[PDB]
Structure 1
Amino acid sequence: ERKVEKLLVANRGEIACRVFRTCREMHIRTVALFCEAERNAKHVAEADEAVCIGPPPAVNSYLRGEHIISVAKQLNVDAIHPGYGFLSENASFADAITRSGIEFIGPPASAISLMGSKSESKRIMEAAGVPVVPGYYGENQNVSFLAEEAKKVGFPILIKAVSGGGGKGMKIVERPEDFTFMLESAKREATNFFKDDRVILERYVKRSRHIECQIFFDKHGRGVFFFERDCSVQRRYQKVLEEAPAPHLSMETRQRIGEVALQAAKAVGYVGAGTVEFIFDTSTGEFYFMEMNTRLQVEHPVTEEVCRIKGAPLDLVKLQIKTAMGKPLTFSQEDVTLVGSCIEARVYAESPERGFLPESGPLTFIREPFQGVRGPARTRLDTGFREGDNVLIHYDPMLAKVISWGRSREEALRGLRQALGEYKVAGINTNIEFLKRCCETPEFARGGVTTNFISEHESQLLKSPVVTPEVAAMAATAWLLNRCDNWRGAFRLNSDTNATVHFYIDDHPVEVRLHTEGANYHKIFFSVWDHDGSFEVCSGPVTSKHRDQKSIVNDFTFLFENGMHHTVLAVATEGDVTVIGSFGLHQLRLLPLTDGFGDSSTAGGTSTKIVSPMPGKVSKLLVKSGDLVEKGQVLVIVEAMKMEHPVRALQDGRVSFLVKEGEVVGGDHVLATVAEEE
């Protein structure tokens, strides 16, 4: 075999840190890669050496496979792990690595190329004999052929069409012995949706739930399938929350899922770690092949919590290095046993209220949930970002992954709830509120959720706590104090103090007024939305005198008269005030009040504009008539004894020319009328 002492990573993020960590235990060197800048990132602070690769766009960075290979050769690298994304699925890169002599980590290039095309892949599995639900059989040569194979090839009837998602030819015709309505439905589908007259028939499944078993193989002909998984929950083809132990799955089935999976991988030949994905209908009770991926998934640490080998913790990445080592395995499929249950959820730096659009901004304060064992449950968090970091728009929005291992499902789900609640980030809106809403009200604790489970409950979700009038009181107070000495040393005569804050909550401005009575800075009141009360407030140490973009992060205490007390860590800026406490997190936008403060001119500008002196001789006018002029460009240039003396009018609005180039004009002539755009 070939010794390995240097490890190379392609991608960046959580996978970089994960690959780097275990490496320490195996006692192997590490190498990091980073784009323009991106040098303060954590992963590079974790490796032994890092190299800059070039411009931010993914074409420029992490896609120059030849340059990466040349750099690795110069470094005499032993192994490369592509990870997921970028060159994860590219057979040319793997072949070039093999020619260079470096041990590529993953499947051979032949498997990747074969699975690149869906038609040839499904051909291979059909030849292998795995139950596969195909996409098409022939064409609509005859309408009687539809009745011929309707009860033949596939009893379930999937009429549909050659293409297009309209699918009005379907009509949900699950009843066999249908011969006068299927042809009428197809012919009415052909109208206004002719496309190609060829029609394909398949089996139609009422329900769908996604399954995906894991597999592992050495290069000495020996492997063992890991435990199954579930990915029923996904929105817009994006993974949201998943469970390694498919609840409600019989043991016997588990076993069989393996025999089918091993047949397919052996047929194409496979080395390393991979995952086979199925599609399943509860009503039919059978699973049909949909797709496979020849690449390590992102969901690898999840399935790990439900599998132990020889009573020892399993490390998936470890074996992949050992597989690259050339050593053979040590365990049969038997040594592996499941223990308990676990659940996972992904947090995305997106805004649930909006069109789930990514946002980029500095990370102000990041609470870290307790990543230790307690009670009947294990909870962990893996994050590829830390304090002081900033999200890049080029990358996908992905902060951290939270997993709750437990002895029973209940324990696991309950654990997450509390953890999901505890983790807190300030600075960018996240979908963390959405995930908690997905966990509380939906009765998916039973364990039965379909592929389209998210679609129906969209009305129930997308809901957040209501900002109580009290929340404005602590939020408003923090912005003042966390900016200046408002209410500090203040003093007037025979009167009392007053200071107000305007919040632009939703599309309606909000005003909050704060004032004091007595000689007390401590005793304070409030009146928001016609609700009045009293409270006292005690601050903490003063921090962040520089009041930069991060501004001031301080803890606050508020004793309201009723009797309560509160603690609030407020990082306030001019743009917004963020308050985090037992209520949760809420950011209140401050009413924006900016509008070219100075240049606010509504003057008509009717006549006598950019008038030229006596000599005249206007020429070389470079402004189009009827075009807005707010900045002071040279509207007209007139020459008086070689005196260009450009007028440079700054009156806003479009300018209308009444003169032409080369025309001698009199003194103080109306060359143009600079009027407000009407």
Structure 2
Amino acid sequence: ERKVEKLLVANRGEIACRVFRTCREMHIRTVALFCEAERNAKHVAEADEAVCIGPPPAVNSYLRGEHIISVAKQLNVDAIHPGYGFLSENASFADAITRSGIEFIGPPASAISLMGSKSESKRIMEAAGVPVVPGYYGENQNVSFLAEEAKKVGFPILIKAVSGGGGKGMKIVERPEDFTFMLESAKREATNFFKDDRVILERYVKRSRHIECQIFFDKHGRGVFFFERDCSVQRRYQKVLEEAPAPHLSMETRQRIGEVALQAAKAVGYVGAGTVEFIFDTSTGEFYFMEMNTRLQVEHPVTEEVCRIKGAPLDLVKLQIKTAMGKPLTFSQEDVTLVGSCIEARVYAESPERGFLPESGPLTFIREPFQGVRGPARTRLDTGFREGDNVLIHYDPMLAKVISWGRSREEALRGLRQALGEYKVAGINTNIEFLKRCCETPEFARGGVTTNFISEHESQLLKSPVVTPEVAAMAATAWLLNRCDNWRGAFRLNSDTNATVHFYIDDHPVEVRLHTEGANYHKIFFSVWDHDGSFEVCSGPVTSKHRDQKSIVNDFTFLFENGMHHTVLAVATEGDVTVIGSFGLHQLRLLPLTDGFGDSSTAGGTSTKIVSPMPGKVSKLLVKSGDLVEKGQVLVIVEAMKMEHPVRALQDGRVSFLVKEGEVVGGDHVLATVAEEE
């Protein structure tokens, strides 16, 4: 075999840190890669050496496979792990690595190329004999052929069409012995949706739940399938929350899922770690092949919590290095046993209220949930970002992954709830509120959720706590104090103090007024939305005198008269005030009040504009008539004894020319009328 002492990573993020960590235990060197800048990132602070690769766009960075290979050769690298994304699925890169002599980590290039095309892949599995639900059989040569194979090839009837998602030819015709309505439905589908007259028939499944078993193989002909998984929950083809132990799955089935999976991988030949994905209908009770991926998934640490080998913790990445080592395995499929249950959820730096659009901004304060064992449950968090970091728009929005291992499902789900609640980030809106809403009200604790489970409950979700009038009181107070000495040393005569804050909550401005009575800075009141009360407030140490973009992060205490007390860590800026406490997190936008403060001119500008002196001789006018002029460009240039003396009018609005180039004009002539755009 070939010794390995240097490890190379392609991608960046959580996978970089994960690959780097175990490496320490195996006592192997590490190498990091980073784009323009991106040098303060954590992963590079974790490796032994890092190299800059070039411009931010993914074409420029992490796609120059030849340059990466040349750099690795110069470094005499032993192994490369592509990870997921970028060159994860590219057979040319793997072949070039093999020619260079470096041990590529993953499947051979032949398997990747074969699975690149869906038609040839499904051909291979059909030849292998695995139950596969195909996409098409022939064409609509005859309408009687539809009745011929309707009860033949596939009893379930999937009429549909050659293409297009309209699918009005379907009509949900699950009843066999249908011969006068299927042809009428197809012919009415052909109208206004002719496309190609060829029609394909398949089996139609009422329900769908996604399954995906894991597999592992050495290069000495020996492997063992890991435990199954579930990915029923996904929105817009994006993974949201998943469970390694498919609840409600019989043991016997588990076993069989393996025999089918091993047949397919052996047929194409496979080395390393991979995952086979199925599609399943509860009503039919059978699973049909949909797709496979020849690449390590992102969901690898999840399935790990439900599998132990020889009573020892399993490390998936470890074996992949050992597989690259050339050593053979040590365990049969038997040594592996499941223990308990676990659940996972992904947090995305997106805004749930909006069109789930990514946002980029500095990370102000990041609470870290307790990543230790307690009670009947294990909870962990893996994050590829830390304090002081900033999200890049080029990358996908992905902060951290939270997993709750437990002895029973209940324990696991309950654990997450509390953890999901505890983790807190300030600075960018996240979908963390959405995930908690997905966990509390939906009765998916039973364990039965379909592929389209998210679609129906969209009305129930997308809901957040209501900002109580009290929340404005602590939020408003923090912005003042966390900016200046408002209410500090203040003093007037025979009167009392007053200071107000305007919040632009939703599309309606909000005003909050704060004032004091007595000689007390401590005793304070409030009146928001016609609700009045009293409270006292005690601050903490003063921090962040520089009041930069991060501004001031301080803890606050508020004793309201009723009797309560509160603690609030407020990082306030001019743009917004963020308050985090037992209520949760809420950011209140401050009413924006900016509008070219100075240049606010509504003057008509009717006549006598950019008038030229006596000599005249206007020429070389470079402004189009009827075009807005707010900045002071040279509207007209007139020459008086070689005196260009450009007028440079700054009156806003479009300018209308009444003169032409080369025309001698009199003194103080109306060359143009600079009027407000009407």
Deviation digits for residues 257-310 of structure 1 (CA, Å, limit 9, x no counterpart): 000000000000000000000000000000000000000000000000000000
SS of structure 1 residue aligned to 2:339: coil
Deviation digits for residues 458-480 of structure 1 (CA, Å, limit 9, x no counterpart): 00000000000000000000000
Deviation digits for residues 67-112 of structure 1 (CA, Å, limit 9, x no counterpart): 0000000000000000000000000000000000000000000000
SS of structure 1 residue aligned to 2:626: coil
Alignment of 1:54-69 (within 5 A): 54-69=54-69
Q: Please give the alpha-carbon distance, in whole angstroms, between the structure 1 residues aligned to 2:365 and 2:507.
A: 27
Q: Please give the alpha-carbon distance, in whole angstroms, between the structure 1 residues aligned to 2:447 and 2:265.
A: 30
Q: Please give the alpha-carbon distance, in whole angstroms, between the structure 2 residues aligned to 1:302 and 1:141.
A: 48
Q: Please give the alpha-carbon distance, in whole angstroms, between the structure 2 residues aligned to 1:397 and 1:549.
A: 21
Task: Mark the runs of 5 or more structure 1 residues left unpaired by the alignment.
Answer: none
Deviation digits for residues 504-563 of structure 1 (CA, Å, limit 9, x no counterpart): 000000000000000000000000000000000000000000000000000000000000
SS of structure 2 residue aligned to 1:291: strand
Task: Mark the runs of 5 or more structure 2 residues left unpaired by the alignment.
Answer: none
Q: Please give the alpha-carbon distance, in whole angstroms, between the structure 1 residues aligned to 2:351 and 2:555.
A: 26
Partner of 2:288: 288
State the shift of 1:113 in Å: 0.0
Q: Please give the alpha-carbon distance, in whole angstroms, between the structure 2 residues aligned to 1:369 and 1:4.
A: 36
SS of structure 2 residue aligned to 1:518: coil
Partner of 2:600: 600
Deviation digits for residues 379-404 of structure 1 (CA, Å, limit 9, x no counterpart): 00000000000000000000000000
Deviation digits for residues 203-245 of structure 1 (CA, Å, limit 9, x no counterpart): 0000000000000000000000000000000000000000000
SS of structure 2 residue aligned to 1:127: helix
Q: After the TM superposition, which segments of 4 or more aligned residues of structure 1 sit over 3 Å from their partners?
A: none
Q: Please give the alpha-carbon distance, in whole angstroms, between the structure 2 residues aligned to 1:636 and 1:297.
A: 65
State the shift of 1:250 in Å: 0.0
State the shift of 1:656 in Å: 0.0
State the shift of 1:451 in Å: 0.0
State the shift of 1:185 in Å: 0.0
State the shift of 1:201 in Å: 0.0
State the shift of 1:349 in Å: 0.0
State the shift of 1:249 in Å: 0.0
SS of structure 2 residue aligned to 1:418: helix
Q: Please give the alpha-carbon distance, in whole angstroms, between the structure 2 residues aligned to 1:444 and 1:184.
A: 40
Q: Please give the alpha-carbon distance, in whole angstroms, between the structure 2 residues aligned to 1:472 and 1:448.
A: 41
Q: Percent identity?
A: 100
State the shift of 1:487 in Å: 0.0
SS of structure 2 residue aligned to 1:177: coil
Alignment of 1:411-490 (within 5 A): 411-490=411-490
Q: Please give the alpha-carbon distance, in whole angstroms, between the structure 2 residues aligned to 1:196 and 1:185.
A: 16
SS of structure 1 residue aligned to 2:161: coil
Q: Please give the alpha-carbon distance, in whole angstroms, between the structure 1 residues aligned to 2:552 and 2:594.
A: 23
SS of structure 2 residue aligned to 1:656: strand
Q: Please give the alpha-carbon distance, in whole angstroms, between the structure 2 residues aligned to 1:503 and 1:264.
A: 61
Q: Please give the alpha-carbon distance, in whole angstroms, between the structure 2 residues aligned to 1:630 and 1:229.
A: 62
Partner of 2:508: 508
Q: Please give the alpha-carbon distance, in whole angstroms, between the structure 2 residues aligned to 1:415 and 1:385.
A: 23
Partner of 2:655: 655
Q: Please give the alpha-carbon distance, in whole angstroms, between the structure 2 residues aligned to 1:607 and 1:220.
A: 92
Partner of 1:213: 213
Q: Please give the alpha-carbon distance, in whole angstroms, between the structure 2 residues aligned to 1:221 and 1:607.
A: 92
Deviation digits for residues 578-622 of structure 1 (CA, Å, limit 9, x no counterpart): 000000000000000000000000000000000000000000000
SS of structure 2 residue aligned to 1:184: helix
Matched, 1:564 2:564: yes
State the shift of 1:648 in Å: 0.0
State the shift of 1:25 in Å: 0.0
State the shift of 1:565 in Å: 0.0
Q: Please give the alpha-carbon distance, in whole angstroms, between the structure 2 residues aligned to 1:305 and 1:43.
A: 24
Q: Please give the alpha-carbon distance, in whole angstroms, between the structure 2 residues aligned to 1:429 and 1:17.
A: 25
Partner of 1:70: 70
The Cα RMSD (Å) is: 0.0
SS of structure 2 residue aligned to 1:385: coil
SS of structure 2 residue aligned to 1:564: coil
> Matched residue pairs, number?
678
Deviation digits for residues 2-40 of structure 1 (CA, Å, limit 9, x no counterpart): 000000000000000000000000000000000000000
SS of structure 2 residue aligned to 1:57: coil
Partner of 2:9: 9
Q: Please give the alpha-carbon distance, in whole angstroms, between the structure 1 residues aligned to 2:562 and 2:446.
A: 41
Partner of 2:643: 643
SS of structure 1 residue aligned to 2:381: strand
State the shift of 1:445 in Å: 0.0
Deviation digits for residues 295-348 of structure 1 (CA, Å, limit 9, x no counterpart): 000000000000000000000000000000000000000000000000000000
Partner of 1:627: 627
Q: Please give the alpha-carbon distance, in whole angstroms, between the structure 1 residues aligned to 2:10 and 2:86.
A: 8
SS of structure 1 residue aligned to 2:620: coil
SS of structure 1 residue aligned to 2:460: coil
Q: Please give the alpha-carbon distance, in whole angstroms, between the structure 2 residues aligned to 1:639 and 1:668.
A: 14
Q: Please give the alpha-carbon distance, in whole angstroms, between the structure 2 residues aligned to 1:171 and 1:650.
A: 66
State the shift of 1:41 in Å: 0.0
